[PDB]
Amino acid sequence: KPSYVKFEVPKELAEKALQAVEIARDTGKIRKGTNETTKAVERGQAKLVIIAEDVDPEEIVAHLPPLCEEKEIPYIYVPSKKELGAAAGIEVAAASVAIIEPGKARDLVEEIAMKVKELMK
RNA sequence: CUGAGCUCGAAAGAGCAAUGAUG
């Protein structure tokens, strides 16, 4: 486990976020890679943000949790950049992803957003 | 900013790329 995990995770919650990224992909609005993830926040209203637990250097995503406390935005880690990339519809690894519109996945974002907001306290 | 594309020979497939191709 890296230095920037602000909370620990079972096999669940991070796998439910992985299949949330799939369902938003064509049915809603998704943005790809850590720069587009960072833009998604600063343009004022992301819906959620996803990060890979296996990043090296780890310091390159360390600006996302702080930025997510300034913007009141909820976030969650998933087991690898290579399975995050696959979920996002691409074949290169992705250190992070952002949700602009959940599509079909509105109520799937809502039930995990609520649980993120408690395991963060 | 855009945000996925690019490099090559043949009968072919490998490599680069969201840790950023194109512009």
UniProtKB/Swiss-Prot annotation:
Protein family according to the UniProt entry: Belongs to the eukaryotic ribosomal protein eL8 family.
Its recorded name reads: Large ribosomal subunit protein eL8
Concerning InterPro entries, the annotation shows: eL8/uL1-like, Ribosomal_eL30-like_sf, Ribosomal_eL8-like_CS, Ribosomal_eL8/eL30/eS12/Gad45, Ribosomal_eL8/Nhp2, Ribosomal_eL8_arc
Keyword check for rRNA processing: yes
Give the species.
Pyrococcus furiosus (strain ATCC 43587 / DSM 3638 / JCM 8422 / Vc1)
Q: What UniProt keywords are attached to this protein's entry? A: Cytoplasm, Ribonucleoprotein, Ribosomal protein, RNA-binding, rRNA processing, rRNA-binding, tRNA processing
Q: Where is this chain primarily localised?
A: cytoplasm
Subunit (UniProt): May be present in up to 3 copies per 70S ribosome. Part of the 50S ribosomal subunit, where it binds 23S rRNA at its canonical site near the L1 stalk, as well as a possible second 50S binding site near helix 25 and a possible third site on the beak of the 30S subunit. Component of box C/D small ribonucleoprotein (sRNP) particles that contain rpl7ae, FlpA and nop5, plus a guide RNA. These sRNP particles form homodimers, giving rise to an asymmetric holoenzyme. Probably part of the RNase P complex.
Where in or outside the cell?
A: Cytoplasm
Q: What is the name of the gene encoding this protein? A: rpl7ae
Q: Name one Pfam family in it.
A: Ribosomal_L7Ae
Alphabetically, the GO molecular function entries are: ribonuclease P activity; rRNA binding; structural constituent of ribosome
Whether Nucleotide-binding counts among this entry's keywords is no
